[PDB]
Amino acid sequence: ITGTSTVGVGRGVLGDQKNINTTYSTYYYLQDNTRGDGIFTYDAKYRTTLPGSLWADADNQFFASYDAPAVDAHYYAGVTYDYYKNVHNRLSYDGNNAAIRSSVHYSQGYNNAFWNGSEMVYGDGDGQTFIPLSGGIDVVAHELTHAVTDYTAGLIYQNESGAINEAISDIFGTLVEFYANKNPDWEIGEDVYTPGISGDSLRSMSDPAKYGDPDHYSKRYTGTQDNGGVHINSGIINKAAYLISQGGTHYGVSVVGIGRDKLGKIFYRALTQYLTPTSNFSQLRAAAVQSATDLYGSTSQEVASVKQAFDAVGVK
Numbered sequence: 022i023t024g025t026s027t028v029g030v031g032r033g034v035l036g037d038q039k040n041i042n043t044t045y046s047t048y049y050y051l052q053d054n055t056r057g058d059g060i061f062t063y064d065a066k067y068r069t070t071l072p073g074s075l076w077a078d079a080d081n082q083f084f085a086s087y088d089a090p091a092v093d094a095h096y097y098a099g100v101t102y103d104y105y106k107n108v109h110n111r112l113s114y115d116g117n118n119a120a121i122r123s124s125v126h127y128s129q130g131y132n133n134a135f136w137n138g139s140e141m142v143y144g145d146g147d148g149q150t151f152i153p154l155s156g157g158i159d160v161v162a163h164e165l166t167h168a169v170t171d172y173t174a175g176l177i178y179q180n181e182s183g184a185i186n187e188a189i190s191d192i193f194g195t196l197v198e199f200y201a202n203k204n205p206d207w208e209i210g211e212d213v214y215t216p217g218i219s220g221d222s223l224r225s226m227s228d229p230a231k232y233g234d235p236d237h238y239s240k241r242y243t244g245t246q247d248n249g250g251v252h253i254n255s256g257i258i259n260k261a262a263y264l265i266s267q268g269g270t271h272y273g274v275s276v277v278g279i280g281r282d283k284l285g286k287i288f289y290r291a292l293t294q295y296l297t298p299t300s301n302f303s304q305l306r307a308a309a310v311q312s313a314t315d316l317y318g319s320t321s322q323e324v325a326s327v328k329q330a331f332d333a334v335g336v337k
């Protein structure tokens with residue numbers, strides 16, 4: 022919509038107060054004109070017809086519980102935008118400041134969130150397994166990273182390339198959580214998962230096996246469920262990225278950690294320069310090694326750590 026850029030205030034899903042960039046034209050809309058060609062948040066109104074209506078508010082105050090998921094979708098989209106721009110010099114998901122669009126209140130009791138090829142979509146959860154999914158910065162950045170992958174490597178969403186596509190989203194979703202720096206960790210979705218249970222999440226990068234995911238290639242899932250295990254086998258790559266950043270000994274193989282910033286650089290470079298739609302795990306290892314070599318040199322600690330991390334998870 023055409024109007025003036027304004028600044029509203031509201032509460033997110035977890036009761037935290039924040040400012041949001043809005044646009045004024047009769048109503049105050051969730052339209053942030055300060056980043057690229059806009060960040061736009063819509064109301065799906067418990068339906069599945071997308072995008073729904075551009076979110077409109079009478080007074081620029083967003084404190085109703087109905088407002089909360091839209092507050093977070095809009096705000097965390099802006100944080101993720103800032104991360105890619107400030108850290109990777111990437112403008113929006115296509116690298117050309119494409120508008121970022123999100124719809125919240127999708128369906129009824131919908132325990133999931135996803136990128137549909139054109140926009141972000143968040144359920145409200147059923148209140149037991151999930152609360153509104155946009156309350157998790159790692160969930161928002163996970164899903165926006167799928168848009169990044171779709172415009173770069175284009176990793177096919179099946180089998181090994183699919184598990185890479187998943188891992189990449191877990192990695193950058195986690196690096197975005199650390200960038201925003203509110204209770205960061207190496208688990209996925211903990212802020213919005215199971216409000217009755219402390220300390221759990223959907224997935225762990227530091228210990229995939231915690232939730233039944235493989236942490237070594239010899240444990241890969243080779244069946245047909247979950248598109249050949251894209252959310253299951255990502256554990257192998259998640260563990261490798263955790264090792265590259267943090268270090269550790271995993272099945273007897275020791276890895277020297279190089280930290281989050283370097284992990285982010287190496288994997289962003291692999292994603293955007295080396296990976297292709299059909300890349301398998303072994304080709305990921307070569308891309309990450311070539312990335313680390315470009316960035317730090319072939320004799321570097323960084324290259325040696327990438328090789329050790331992939332050895333530790335059984336990927337040659």
Ligand SMILES: [Ca+2]
Nearest residue numbers: 078080082083
């Ligand atoms: Ca209001």
Ligand SMILES: [Ca+2]
Nearest residue numbers: 203204205206
């Ligand atoms: Ca956290």
Ligand SMILES: [Ca+2]
Nearest residue numbers: 159208209210
């Ligand atoms: Ca997390």
Ligand SMILES: [Ca+2]
Nearest residue numbers: 214215216218
């Ligand atoms: Ca929980």
Ligand SMILES: [Zn+2]
Nearest residue numbers: 163167187190
């Ligand atoms: Zn995903």
